[PDB]
Amino acid sequence: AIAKLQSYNYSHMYIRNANFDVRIDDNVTPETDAQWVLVPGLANSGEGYVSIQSVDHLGYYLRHWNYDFRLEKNDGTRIFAEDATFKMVPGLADPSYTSFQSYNYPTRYIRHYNYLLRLDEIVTALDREDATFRVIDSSSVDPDKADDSVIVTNPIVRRRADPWVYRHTDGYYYMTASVPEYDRIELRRSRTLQGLSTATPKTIWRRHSSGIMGGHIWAPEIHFIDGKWYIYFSAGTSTNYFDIRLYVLECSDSNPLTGTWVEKGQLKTNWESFTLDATTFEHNGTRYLVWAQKDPKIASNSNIYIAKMNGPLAITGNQVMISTPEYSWEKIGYAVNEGPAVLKKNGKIFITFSASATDANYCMGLLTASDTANLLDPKSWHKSPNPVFQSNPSTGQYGPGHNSFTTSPDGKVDIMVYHARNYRDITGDPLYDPNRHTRAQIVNWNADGTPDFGIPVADGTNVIYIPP
Ligand SMILES: OC[C@@H]1O[C@@H](O)[C@H](O)[C@H]1O
Ligand SMILES: OC[C@@H]1O[C@@H](O)[C@H](O)[C@H]1O
Ligand SMILES: [Mg+2]
């Protein structure tokens, strides 16, 4: 069967053939360089054992030689067959994934190192992750196949935080997220939320090697505005990774996974300071920017602001603070409001935000305005006094937040996409614990028309929506 072999720790990268060089790469072009045929093993066709055949050079297989990997044509020798036969076993870093144990060296596994493929003994946790792969084959969810039922297995996407999911008018969801290295902007698409798991992501932009846009790269969001694609994202500098401002990329091409992305520069606000997590929405003919920013006069890391926009590339007028940390549940670790996300429903405009540190104490609050009010008047916005989404020990989910909102494909139900960890205790600076995973669940509605987010669902299969 035809398969891609995706790295466990670099999930944007795939085992591929590069003119007979065997490596892992992202943005594999042509895509067939990353496609393999898993066949019954040359040295043993029986249970477990496979051989990994090139789709372009049939009769050529991956074989180890002096513990390095080569793509070579089967020469009919027993040594070749043994060097090209591997038992598929449960993944060494995660038994739900796959590892490839050598037929003739059964203590050695296929692993990547400096992006090249080797056959090594596996000792460290690094080794285990380097030797674990996700097999994407014909039984995997096809991201190009439409389906009105929303059934996901959470986590949908491992090790992606701040998930942004945008349902476009072409019948695809588009997803951007923070990557654990905070060093690039990643895009994927799927007609179903579950297909986001198996979709091939593309690195559409990498940070500069010095200076501006050269520090932390955080929380990109892709939007379609006035016929063009925009990515709003936050970036520090190479000399201060945390001197973060808003930046914009633009793509006029219709497919953002194949089109050309252009830097447009900084999206400036009323003053220069720590600024991040921008989103935008339209209502009654006006477009707004909603974002997080430090005010030097307020002892919080950031507050929530709204402003009218003047096209996709600027705000106009004065920015208005509509949330600042006030309750103790906004100030665990440090005082912060960030990650705004907009949901329109029932004659209201809802803005969730995240608060407290990005460890298990992370949680969400809610702002509510009437959709006929002046959205630039702070008195139009009401903050809920308690968190509206938070850790839940009984479901094993910790620090949920920086969410986005989307819908089922038929638009009839609202779905929240957010990150959380499936353990509580973090060693070290939580910013560098990479295990916030992307997941989704239904948004329920109270009789009074306000959202009920419930509690973060436990890992596993979640039936979000079946149409009537
Ligand atoms: O790659 C390890 C061994 O080195 C080579 O000599 C053999 O073909 C292979 O089995
Ligand atoms: O191959 C990519 C990385 O390079 C080496 O640093 C590591 O072993 C591996 O994770
Ligand atoms: Mg966001």
Author numbering: 7 to 474
From the paper:
Here, we describe the structure and function of AtAbf43C, an uncharacterized GH family 43 subfamily 26 (GH43_26) α-L-arabinofuranosidase (EC 3.2.1.55) from A. thermocellus. We solved high-resolution crystal structures of full-length AtAbf43C and its individual carbohydrate binding module family 42 (CBM42) and GH43 domains, including a structure with L-arabinofuranose molecules bound to the CBM42. The predicted 580 amino acid protein consists of an N-terminal signal peptide (residues 1–19), a CBM42 domain (residues 29–160), a GH43 domain (residues 179–488), and a C-terminal dockerin I domain (residues 511–568). Taken together, we demonstrate through structural and functional characterization that AtAbf43C is an active arabinofuranosidase, specialized in degrading AOSs to arabinose in an exo manner.
First, the arabinose-bound structure of full-length AtAbf43C builds upon previous work by Ribeiro et al., by providing structural evidence for a nonfunctional α-binding pocket, with arabinose only bound in the β- and γ- subdomains. In addition to the two arabinose molecules bound to the CBM42 domain, the structure contains three glycerol molecules and a central magnesium ion in the GH43 domain. In the β pocket, the arabinose molecule formed hydrogen bonds with three residues, Y73, H70, and D89. Similarly, the arabinose in the γ pocket contacted Y121, H118, and D136, as well as an additional residue N120. In the previous study of this CBM42 by Ribeiro et al., residues D39, D91, and D136 were individually altered to alanine. The binding domain of AtAbf43C also closely aligned with the CBM42 domain in SaAraf43A. However, while both structures had sugars in their β-subdomains, the SaAraf43A CBM42 had an arabinobiose bound in its α-pocket, and an unliganded γ-pocket. Furthermore, alignment of binding residues in the α-pocket differed significantly between the two proteins, with AtAbf43C possessing a proline and two glutamines at positions where SaAraf43A possesses glutamine, histidine, and aspartate residues, respectively.
